[PDB]
Symmetry: C3
């Protein structure tokens, strides 16, 4: 993040230098038009006015990008503040103040919503897709922090309070998932699509930890629905992972997709294990059936790794 603050600052410094140069050439065209005007000489003068505004627009573009990088760093500090207050509320539950920790967690939830609204805004207006991925990488941390909040509520006994929190993280995962899918779809390089796939693999594991926590509350009826969203997302990611490795600039992008495709298999095992504990063994064996589909997909990738 701090390195993206560096790049956006260096590129902003270049555009501002060229904008200052195009300003001096704008004033030289004032001299060229002060000596003698003409009907067609003005055309070449407006060429500088256009180059002046376009140099200003590009500077205001990178300036907005540098502010985005500064906004991503402030948002990262906001997540760390929430994490400190979560561990603080965790300390309160362990120390004995289980009642006061519920006020610290309701603060962090309003904080998480506020950092979410910023990160989602930073993701939409992202001239560079790395701004969106870094924003999604922090939105992922907000979701995992939302899961850690619900586990403290469940540990404190506020199971009804934790379900709504888990339902909120469930809706946050889908929103970030759709953003990550757009980044991967529109990814010009295979590296950016793989970075979105690494976060998508995490959003599935977050979706799994929600399901197990939903099972611990007793809401085995909704953890089924949540596992249906994780199993669906794994299929999309696997489609993406197989496509990234098929059209591989470097073979290192295929092996990393092979590692992630193994993770989709492993995460699919826990889904079937959790579906077994829910009693839905029929849908669990179908989940294992998808795992054997992905296993074959990983196996054929390792063959291209050697062949």
């Amino acid at each position: 993040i701090m390195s993206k603050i560096a790049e956006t600052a260096k590129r902003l410094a270049d555009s501002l230098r060229e904008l200052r140069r195009i300003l001096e050439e704008l004033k030289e065209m004032l001299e060229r038009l002060e000596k003698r005007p003409d009907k067609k000489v003005i055309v070449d003068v407006l060429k500088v006015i256009v180059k002046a505004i376009e140099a200003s627009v590009e500077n205001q573009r990178i300036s907005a990008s540098n502010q985005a990088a500064l906004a991503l760093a402030i948002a990262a500090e906001a997540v760390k503040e929430i994490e400190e207050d979560i561990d603080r509320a965790r300390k309160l539950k362990d120390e004995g103040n289980k009642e006061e920790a519920e006020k610290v967690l309701r603060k962090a939830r309003e904080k998480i919503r506020e950092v979410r609204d910023a990160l989602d805004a930073i993701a939409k207006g992202a001239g560079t897709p790395d701004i969106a991925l870094k924003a999604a990488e922090l939105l992922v941390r907000l979701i995992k922090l939302l899961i850690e909040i619900a586990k403290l509520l469940q540990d404190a006994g506020n199971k009804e309070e934790a379900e709504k929190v888990l339902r909120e993280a469930t809706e946050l995962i889908k929103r970030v998932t759709e953003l990550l899918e757009k980044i991967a779809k529109n990814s010009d390089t295979p590296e950016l699509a793989l970075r979105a796939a690494e976060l998508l693999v995490r959003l599935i594991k977050l979706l799994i930890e929600i399901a197990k926590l939903l099972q611990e509350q007793g809401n085995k009826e909704e953890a089924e629905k949540v596992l249906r969203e994780a199993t669906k997302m794994i299929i999309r990611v696997a489609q993406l992972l197989v496509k990234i490795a098929k059209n591989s600039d470097e073979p290192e992008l295929a092996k990393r997709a092979a590692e992630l495709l193994k993770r989709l298999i492993e995460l699919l095992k826990e889904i079937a294990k959790l579906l077994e504990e829910e009693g839905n063994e029929d849908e669990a064996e179908k989940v294992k059936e998808i795992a054997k589909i992905l296993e074959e997909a990983v196996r054929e990738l390792e063959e291209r790794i050697i062949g």
Copy 2:
């Protein structure tokens, strides 16, 4: 604050898009002027140049507003750093290092002055008044943190050091009060004036806690002057609160002004109680006389609530 970073970023993204569109229309006018020039056709071309610069000015406006939101978030993190170092210096007084805590508090005081200089600057150049209110909301926290500093100095025995700190927060309250009064005076909507009134009610309570702390030091001669500023400010706020509730867009703005007007009464009770402890019972009964004025003002508001 993080939500204001979102709004300013989204509005910046829109202005930058329209600035890029007005750039392409600027280059289309280069084509329209390359084919054939004229004496009056140039007029409509400059219309785009004006729309190009105005689209750039508005983008540089929202960009400055987004930087202000980023500056308000960095300032909020600065207040939290000061608060951690205050609680740290509080731990040092409780642990035994009352001598080293005085260096931590002198650091935080120089920090508070620096965050104050930024927040006051952010308040002046606020294209949106919410930038100024959020800035005032953090300047309020700086003042309460300045009060907590002086109480640690008083608890550590540095009564002479705490008075100057309390005199510094007294001068900070007036500065933020004048800003809050300008925001409420110039408030287009009753919501913004009520938000300034909520902070004004806090600045009075801060001014009261300074007075009691000034009484604990023995400077009952200056706590009188400080209570004279709190009693004056309550009158101004009550004038504002009664006016906000009179011209109420929603009746919910009147009840909140009724709650605050009750707080002005309660805060006025402590002023008379502190003036009683100072011995100025004559000015204390006059303070109770203002409380009965506000009580009647609250009562008539509740009648309009029902009538």
Copy 3:
């Protein structure tokens, strides 16, 4: 830093106001050109277009400067996060988790590299030299935090891991030193050159603490090279300090250079003391010879202080 956020915001607010005024004068020139055009009247109209873009360029300049100040504050918070994690890893070594602290220190090292890349970028594109000095002041803290990391590695027994860290801080000191030398060379006022000299005196002491830590590991062969860079840097700084005090706007700048020149002498004593422990007493007496050169340089400065 927060005060520089204030100044850059206030100056940005002024440029944006004048940019809005020059926008209205741009639209008045649209009226002046709508009534009647001419061949030479257009010249004075383009004068406003030039003043409009130049008012926009200066606003985009201060806007980039305000973002730099916001980037310097975010970088300062990043150093404080690294320092908290260093003290945390220090707690882990004292508590017993010497193995897990090595993962916290490798995180902080990647953090230090990232804050370094930003601060170095902020230093290059610094319209105001105070942006570069504040950036160098934080890069100095990154180096001292890098030294505290290596001492924990040495205390944990990872001497081979600490040497590379110390070699990394050694290369960081030179980079910041060259920046500080450029700031002092190009300093218009003697105050800015003295501020660079105060950090240069610290980079030498950091370079000394690296040498002693390199001696504690046993790498007395490289601490010699490091002390050769500190002894060289002291000569450059002393040349700078004597020149700053010679051409002194205020005499207070000479006494502060006298204090720093004493520090260069003291730091030169430890170099000779460390070179004595390394066995290089021959180069150590030559280091004392430079100390007596600086002593005479300080003595002659105190004579001008009185004469």
